[PDB]
Amino acid sequence: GSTVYAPFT
């Protein structure tokens, strides 16, 4: 699968 990894603060 594809991934958007964007944890943020």
Give the pair of three-digit tokens for residue 5: 């990894």
Residue 4, exposed/middle/buried by CB under 10 A (0-12, 13-18, 19+)?
A: exposed
Solving technique: electron diffraction
Find the DSSP H helices in 1-9. Answer: none
- Terminal CA-to-CA distance of the chain, rounded, Å? 25
